[model samples]
Target: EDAMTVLTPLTEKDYEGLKRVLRSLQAHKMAWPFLEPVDPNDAPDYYGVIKEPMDLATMEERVQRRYYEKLTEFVADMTKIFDNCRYYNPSDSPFYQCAEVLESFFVQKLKGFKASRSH
Candidate 1:
């Protein structure tokens, strides 16, 4: 009975739980820009491909720096898009007339509302 218990196949609930955990991990990877799941065997495949006498540590550092450069560019583009949406001004336009108009209208209404309250 002990051996049978140890050798038994996983239950459906166990499989479902495992699948849920994997799905959550995948979703996390999607949410984070730097969280890529690389296969362990991939590194061995690239061994000696460069054909130059290079220090692996230095090469890795250079690659890491380049990756940060890419991430910085991505963040800048994201900031531009956020500014465009919040300010209602795209890159070419460079100004948000609608935001100015809305702020003026809001201030006028707020002053009027305060005046009526008289507090």
Candidate 2:
């Protein structure tokens, strides 16, 4: 028996058409700017994504809130690190800065925490 299955793939034009639809959903409607710039026609993993630009002051407040959260986390982490390394201050430094440990865990961990509310 000699039989082969035939498959068809989307053409470039077809893909571009789909992407344009996505962009319209994003730009006209504002969707998923944090993950990627809203591409007018780019296919995204998620549907019904939209974002509308807000005032600069509002955006600044949002940014400040995020930084404040990170700062608070930094302080709490320092306390935990201090407990781990004994009550003695590490070199009498008021601020605990452990980039390796914090970056490895907090960076990715915080992304999820932040993303949960963004959408």
Clashes per candidate, residues 3 or more apart or on different chains = 0, 7
Instruction: Please provide, for model 2 over 1-119, each residue's C-alpha lDDT reduced to its tens digit, 9 standing for 90 to 100.
Output: 01110122334443343333323333422222222333447535313432232222333343334432322332343234324322222434432233233334434544443344235
Question: What is the lDDT, from 0 to 100, of the residue 63 in candidate 1?
Answer: 40
Off by over 4 Å in 2: 1-102
In model 1, which range of ten residues has the least summed lDDT? 29-38
Model 1 lDDT tens row, 19-67: 3432343243222321232223844532233222222233234343443
TM-score of each: 0.23, 0.21
Q: Which ten residues in a row have the lowest lDDT in candidate 2?
A: 1-10
Best TM-score among the predictions, by candidate number: 1
Clash list (residue pairs), candidate 2: 19-41, 20-41, 23-40, 30-50, 30-51, 31-50, 31-51
- By lDDT, who's the top model here? 1
Q: What is the lDDT of residue 119 in candidate 2?
A: 53
